[PDB]
Ligand binder design. Structure first.
Ligand SMILES: COc1ccc(N)c2c1C(=O)N([C@H]1CCC(=O)NC1=O)C2=O
Ligand SMILES: [Zn+2]
Lengths: 375, 1110
């Protein structure tokens, strides 16, 4: 399979939203381990990851007035990772900062279209709801654990000059990298190969090997913090596994967990059925620059984290293909339900031009899928 | 617990830096050695090194450099610590008093900054205008050395090059010029920059060289007249200057990685280079101007961290992986060669250790060093005996010193008794020769002999008590039993003799040429032992009962019993002794089972003022008095030799460093003055007792890397996991040298470009001879990771159990490994059982007769069946890698490399594990230990200790969460934690081994003790002078590069013990409003004498530190 006649930068632009929006570039970050009070959007159910974009459409006057006054301040709201969605129970969350905004007042109907981005993880202290229905959370800022090298303590001063290794053009290169980077492992109780399992650079390379299978077309971050978050936003896992990935403080533990999920979880089944295989990791492909899965908003303000796959099975197609509000310009969508339990699993996308490639793909919503370890 | 006391038992031994200069005086050449937190100052002499001063610092020394500014008569010392405490020090001596004063000081840390990959670099320019510091990527810090910059104020110049490998200041330049090696996308390069003193910025350097060797790592600034720089890499060495470029790639350095260097002479014509393999080279700069460079191989030294050429061809080799050394470079007739003059002990890196017992006086055996430097170090405290002479003479049953010359005060004879026999040896300096004493009989076994009053010699034997004259040299008088019955036990002094026949004690008296029998009373039960030592005539006389099993003191010459203490038990006593210890008279008594009972005594009263009993050994003790300095001491001869001495009017028993000494006597020969004679079953040794009790370390070189150790008492040996490096051979692997695993008595194997390979072995080293009895080689690519020695299930055998992993370069996580059960029976190792697991066995621990093993992320528990197989009982799939495993009862403490501590409970009625609590904090962790069911100790980055406890307790979330209750910056990297007592307010003992060779002790305190010592520390911090003026609280604060919190729950015993070294008025300043608790909650004003007693007892919980200075 190959991507021909499709601009992979289009889905990342969120063109279905409308005309060019006012942009904001002034970032705002809070001191690590501080208690701030941030407003919560009521209808938002999604679990946000730092560096991830959240597209929104707000029609309610309490939602609209909230964002209107939010733009005049730090442009930041709280996105809660609800453990219990029906009981509104949430223990953690991510701050989302608005970077693009557009207000519509045509026909006297007020609509607010925003593009926000995940910034900081936090722990919930209390959730008090205000008169306008809008909640305000008491939030304790979770910190990002930056860790030095495992050898940064034991490494002898004489073997310090061997820390920087020459350019990487290759198993022989990685064999040499391990022996030089972890040379002072002999001063401790563990082997160099053990230290490799906690080395951010090696772990990122192992993940890059499987991320290259999904996107066969080097546009990933260098910082292990930013890389682990980019990988987390792509992994189509259950809400419980996502809240655990979001709980992790270190990039190394995050990268390790992501590798475990990528090796172990290779099958995607219907969450309601658990008796219907929708697709496998072999079909996952990145039709966007962000990866094989991104959040998009529907015409009613409902956010769907859509995973793009080449082939999907055991799905029934209901309705006729429509290009209205299409998240992949040039494709038409058709609702696809599980053939067993009729659950809305996602949509089949169909090219409108014969010169396009792929001619057909599937966008599956994360909330409808469940990763299963096959045996 | 929540309150801990951490103290050093052995200071760090590894060397991280060494410099030469003129610090102590402009006329003295000094050697300054940095041992992490300590600075040793020596004066280089024609003989050897002279220790003059050793100072401690509240920091890990990261830069140590000597410099001479204009106006200064001698050198100053710049020190920068890992926590960025910079300082300028001056050595000041006035007569016998030495002081290290702080000329300048300050913290040079930046608010933001990415610490460089090749760490801190501190350099000083030849003109001594500034100190250049490379602490962070992209910055170069400059501290001007102006006389008035006392706060070490500095400025930062921006460096475009972000990855600098090494940087030096060049010689003979118009202005301060740095030369550095750096790396960028297009390769590794060399570059220079002038430091504009006015503009405080960089200016274009005199020269630059792009695309230098990919592995170039060292910059050497060559002094005038040549100047320029020498760049050392992996396969080549280059020279650079404005117009000149020299390049050599000698074969001699082809298989070497050079790691250290040193200039031999001021003009920079010769340099010393050291490689990771211990080779020592000489780099020669050949003049025609500079024409070429030449490398010569001198020889082998210890693996060098640093080299320093002293004077007279003497070089100091500073080692981290092996013993440091002083080597003499004896190089026309021969090639240049190196010869070792002196070796200095280095215990580090301590990668593992165990405690042998083995009374609480135990041995500590470590797995020290790496590669060729690898070894076991057996560390024990106690009194050392220098042996001067050995005589092979078996069956000695007694020893007595004699002076066969009335005109001389020195002893010249040694009389030894044997079964039914007596021999006499004469001493003429160091010439012992057997002779015959005219008047003494060889026919009988002597019970006592020696010098008696009126220039005579007595010889009490089973037959008679022969008085012999000195000048005539004949038997002047003799005493025999009135009914010819043999004497059972005999005692004597200079004026009186008390022989005991069965149960009738006859009290004779020594008179000129006569033995007048005064009394002959018969005691109730038989007489086992007696003593008439005067405290010269003795009015009192001790006696032991044969039938009654009691110790009674009788009067003389009245025989009336003044005291009759019924000892009790069934074991009859062996010896009795009356002696004065610190003007307080005591009467020790040894039992037939190595039990030393001690009671007090009065010269006129004769009553027992003590009821204490200390267990000496298994074999009966022979008490013998000897004078040490101006006072008298007692040597206890049992299955374990001991020395009894009074300390603060309370009896103290110190262990002697000898295997078995059954008999001893004090000898003061002309050739052997103030010496003693020790005797065993087959040998007579003449030795001198060591002036002061020091650590006795025995090195067992393995010539390969020891990794793990375990003690098997039943087999009387140690099981040691070790590895050796082998290179791929042309004739398709072969070892680089003979090592412990290739020179074993017996050996087994698991099966029948120059690329390195790790061959893993299990060694069985004998505990007395330390010889490699056996070496089992593991499979190819098999990595031995864990080792235990234990009994499992209902099986009486003791096994050596090893946990392995299969290591393939193409596989990141280990997919296979095994547990091999070995038995060391007779002389060989036998594989009893083998168990294949699907992962790496990182840890193993004997858990209540079962085997607890951690494979990958799983904690598996195995049962040992009667079919001699490991059968799985239960598993625990953790979300963390089970790296660390510690157990206490039915509790398990699992840990991973990222400080993820998890607590498990084995549920016996359920057969599975129940997770009790967890604390996940992301930080690097190197070791864990369980203090009690509630508290857990660990070592985390950077060089810190921590304690966490199970809270816890109202809610389930409180119960399932460990609270951090203790934080402390130790300054060392702990590799191993182990419970153990090395020595005879502190509960429990946990020992730790570090990378630098430091051994420490962590013990528990009560809340009252922790509070008193915590106030005392804060008061001590206001009195103690700190080198570099660093705050103790800053030093001890828990530290990582991102965060710093104060120390809690830990008392620094090294600081508390320094109270003993302060002035008397300063001791009262420290204890001014302290509240001393005397076990009642009723605090009072504490006095200096109260805290002297408290701190003095705290020093007795660990090994004492040697005095550095002569
Ligand atoms: C009740 O949901 C609706 C209702 C109406 C409607 N016009 C849509 C949806 C809805 O979810 N979407 C998705 C389909 C996939 C896509 O690419 N873009 C969208 O926005 C609609 O277009
Ligand atoms: Zn279904």
């Amino acid at each position: 399979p190959n991507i021909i006649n499709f601009d992979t930068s289009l889905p990342t632009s969120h063109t279905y939203l409308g005309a060019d929006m006012e942009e904001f570039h002034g970032r705002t970050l809070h001191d690590d381990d501080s208690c701030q009070v941030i407003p919560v959007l009521p209808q938002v159910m999604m679990i946000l990851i730092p560096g991830q974009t959240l597209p929104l459409q707000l029609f309610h006057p309490q939602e609209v007035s909230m964002v209107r006054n939010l733009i005049q301040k730090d442009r930041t709201f709280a996105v809660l990772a609800y453990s219990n969605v029906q009981e509104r129970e949430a223990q953690f969350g991510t701050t989302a900062e608005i970077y693009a905004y557009r207000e519509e007042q045509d026909f006297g109907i007020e609509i607010v279209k925003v593009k926000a981005i995940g910034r900081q993880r936090f722990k919930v202290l209390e959730l008090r709801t205000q008169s306008d229905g809008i909640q305000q959370a008491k939030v304790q800022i979770l910190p990002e654990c930056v860790l030095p090298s495992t050898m940064s303590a034991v490494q002898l001063e004489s073997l310090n000059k061997c820390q920087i290794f020459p350019s990487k053009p290759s198993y022989k290169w990685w064999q040499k990298y391990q022996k030089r980077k972890f040379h002072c492992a002999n001063l401790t109780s563990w082997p160099r190969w053990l230290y490799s399992l906690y080395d951010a650079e090696t772990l990122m390379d192992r993940i890059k090997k499987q991320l290259r299978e999904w996107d066969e077309n080097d546009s990933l971050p260098s910082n292990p913090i930013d890389f682990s978050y980019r990988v987390a936003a792509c992994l189509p896992i259950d809400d419980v596994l996502r809240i655990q990935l979001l709980k992790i403080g270190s990039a190394i533990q995050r990268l390790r967990c992501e590798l475990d999920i990528m090796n172990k979880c290779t099958s995607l089944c219907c969450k309601q059925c658990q008796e219907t295989e929708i697709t496998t990791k072999n079909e996952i492909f990145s039709l966007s620059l962000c990866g094989p899965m991104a959040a998009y908003v529907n015409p009613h303000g409902y956010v769907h984290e859509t995973l793009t796959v080449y082939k999907a099975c055991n799905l029934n197609l209901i309705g006729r293909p429509s290009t209205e509000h299409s998240w992949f310009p040039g494709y038409a969508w058709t609702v696809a339900q599980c053939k067993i339990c009729a659950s809305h699993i996602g949509w089949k996308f169909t090219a409108t031009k014969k010169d396009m490639s792929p001619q057909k793909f599937w966008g599956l919503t994360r909330s409808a899928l469940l990763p299963t370890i096959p045996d | 617990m929540s309150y801990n006391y951490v103290v050093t038992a052995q200071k760090p031994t590894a060397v991280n830096g060494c410099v030469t200069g003129h610090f102590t005086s402009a006329e003295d050449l000094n050697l300054l050695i940095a041992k992490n937190t300590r600075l040793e100052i020596y004066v280089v002499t024609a003989e050897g090194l002279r220790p003059v001063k050793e100072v401690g610092m509240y920091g890990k020394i990261a830069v140590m450099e000597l410099f001479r500014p204009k106006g200064e008569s001698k050198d100053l010392l710049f020190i920068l610590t890992a926590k960025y405490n910079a300082c300028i020090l001056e050595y000041k001596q006035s007569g016998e008093s030495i002081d290290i004063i702080t000329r300048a000081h300050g913290n040079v840390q930046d608010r933001i900054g990415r610490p460089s990959e090749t760490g801190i670099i501190g350099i000083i320019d030849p003109e001594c205008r500034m100190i250049g510091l490379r602490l962070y990527d992209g910055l170069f810090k400059v501290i001007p050395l102006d006389r008035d910059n006392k706060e070490l104020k500095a400025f930062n110049i921006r460096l475009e090059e972000l990855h600098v490998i090494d940087v030096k200041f060049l010689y003979g330049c118009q202005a301060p010029t740095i030369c550095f090696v750096y790396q960028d996308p297009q390769g590794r390069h060399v570059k220079t920059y002038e430091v504009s003193l006015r503009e405080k910025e960089f200016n274009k350097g005199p020269w630059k060289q792009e695309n230098v060797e990919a592995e170039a790592s060292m910059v050497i600034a060559v002094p005038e007249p040549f100047g320029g720089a020498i760049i050392i890499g992996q396969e080549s060495i280059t020279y650079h200057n404005g117009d000149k470029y020299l390049a050599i790639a000698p074969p001699i350095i082809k298989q070497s990685t050079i790691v250290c260097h040193n200039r031999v002479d001021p003009n920079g014509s010769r340099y010393l280079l050291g490689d990771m393999e211990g080779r020592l080279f000489m780099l020669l700069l050949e003049k025609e101007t500079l024409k070429d460079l030449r490398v010569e191989l001198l020889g082998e030294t210890s693996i060098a961290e640093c080299l320093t050429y002293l004077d007279n061809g003497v070089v100091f080799v500073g080692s981290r992986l092996g013993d440091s050394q002083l080597v003499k470079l004896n190089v026309n007739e021969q090639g240049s060669y190196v010869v070792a003059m002196e070796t200095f002990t280095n215990l580090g890196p301590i990668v593992d250790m165990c405690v042998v017992d083995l009374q609480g006086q135990g041995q500590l055996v470590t797995c020290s060093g790496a590669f060729k430097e690898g070894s076991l170090r057996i560390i024990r405290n106690g009194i050392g005996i220098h042996e001067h002479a050995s005589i092979d003479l078996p069956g000695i049953k007694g020893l007595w010193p004699l002076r066969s010359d009335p005109n001389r005060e020195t002893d010249d004879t040694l009389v030894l008794s044997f079964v039914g026999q007596t021999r006499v040896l004469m001493l003429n300096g160091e010439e012992v020769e057997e002779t015959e004493l005219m008047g003494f009989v060889d026919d009988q076994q002597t019970f006592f002999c020696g010098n008696v009053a009126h220039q005579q010699l007595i010889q009490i034997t089973s037959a008679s008590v022969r008085l012999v004259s000195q000048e005539p040299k004949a038997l002047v008088s003799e005493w025999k039993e009135p009914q010819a019955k043999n004497i059972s036990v005999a005692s004597c002094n200079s004026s009186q003799v008390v022989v005991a026949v069965g149960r009738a004690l006859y009290y004779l008296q020594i008179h000129p040429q006569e033995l007048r029998q005064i009394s002959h009373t018969e005691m109730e039960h038989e007489v086992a032992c007696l003593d008439i030592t005067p405290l010269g005539l003795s009015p009192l006389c001790a006696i032991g009962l044969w039938t009654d099993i009691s110790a009674r003191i009788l009067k003389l010459p009245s025989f009336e019993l003044l005291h009759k203490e019924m000892l009790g038990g069934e074991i009859i006593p062996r010896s009795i002794l009356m002696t004065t210890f610190e003007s307080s008279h005591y009467l020790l008594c040894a039992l037939g089972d190595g039990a030393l009972f001690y009671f007090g005594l009065n010269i006129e009263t004769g009553l027992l003022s003590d009821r204490k009993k200390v267990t000496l050994g298994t074999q009966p003790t022979v008490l013998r008095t000897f004078r040490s300095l101006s006072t008298t001491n007692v040597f206890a001869c049992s299955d374990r030799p001991t020395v009894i001495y009074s300390s603060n009017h309370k009896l103290v028993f110190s262990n002697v460093n000898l295997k078995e000494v059954n008999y001893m006597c004090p000898l003061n020969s002309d050739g052997y003055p103030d010496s003693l004679a020790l005797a065993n079953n087959s040998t007579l040794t003449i030795g001198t007792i060591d002036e002061i009790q020091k650590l006795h370390i025995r090195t067992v070189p393995l010539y390969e890397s020891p990794r793990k150790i375990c003690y098997q008492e039943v087999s009387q040996c140690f099981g040691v996991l070790s590895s050796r490096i082998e290179v791929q051979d042309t004739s398709g692997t072969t070892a680089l040298r003979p090592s412990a695993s290739t020179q074993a008595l017996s050996s087994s194997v698991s099966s029948s470009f120059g690329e390195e390979v790790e061959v893993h072995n299990l060694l069985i080293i004998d505990q007395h001879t330390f010889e490699v009895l056996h070496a089992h080689q593991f499979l190819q690519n098999e990595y031995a990771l864990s080792l235990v020695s234990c009994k499992l299930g209902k099986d009486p055998n003791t096994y050596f159990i090893v946990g392995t992993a299969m290591v393939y370069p193409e596989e990141a996580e280990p997919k296979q490994g095994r547990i091999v059960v070995f038995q060391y029976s007779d002389g060989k190792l036998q594989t009893v059982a083998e168990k294949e697991v699907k992962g790496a066995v990182y840890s193993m621990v004997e858990f209540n007769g079962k085997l607890l093993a951690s494979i990958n992320s799983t904690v598996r528990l195995y049962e040992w069946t009667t079919e001699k197989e490991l059968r799985t009982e239960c598993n625990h799939y953790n979300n963390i890698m089970a790296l660390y495993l510690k157990t206490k009862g039915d509790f398990i403490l699992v840990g991973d490399l990222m400080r993820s501590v998890l607590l498990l409970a084995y549920k016996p009625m359920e057969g599975n594990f129940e997770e009790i609590a967890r604390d996940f904090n992301p930080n690097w962790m190197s070791a864990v230990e369980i203090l009690d069911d509630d508290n857990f100790l660990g070592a985390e980055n950077a060089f810190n200790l921590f304690v966490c406890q199970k809270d816890s307790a109202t809610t389930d979330e409180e119960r399932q969460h460990l609270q951090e209750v203790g934080l402390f910056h130790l300054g060392e990297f702990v590799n191993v934690f182990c419970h153990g007592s090395l020595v005879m307010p502190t509960q429990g003992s946990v020992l730790f081994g570090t990378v630098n060779g430091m051994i420490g002790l962590v013990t528990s305190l009560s809340e009252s003790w922790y509070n008193l010592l915590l106030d005392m520390q804060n008061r001590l911090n206001k009195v103690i002078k700190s080198v570099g003026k660093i705050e103790h609280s800053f030093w001890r604060s828990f530290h990582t590069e991102r965060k710093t919190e104060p120390a809690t729950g830990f008392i620094d015993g090294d600081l508390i013990e320094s109270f003993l070294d302060i002035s008397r008025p300063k001791m009262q300043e420290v204890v001014a409003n302290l509240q001393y608790d005397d076990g009642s909650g009723m605090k009072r004003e504490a006095t200096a004498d109260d805290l002297i007693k408290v701190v003095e007892e705290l020093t007795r919980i660990h090994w004492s530190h040697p005095q550095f200075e002569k």
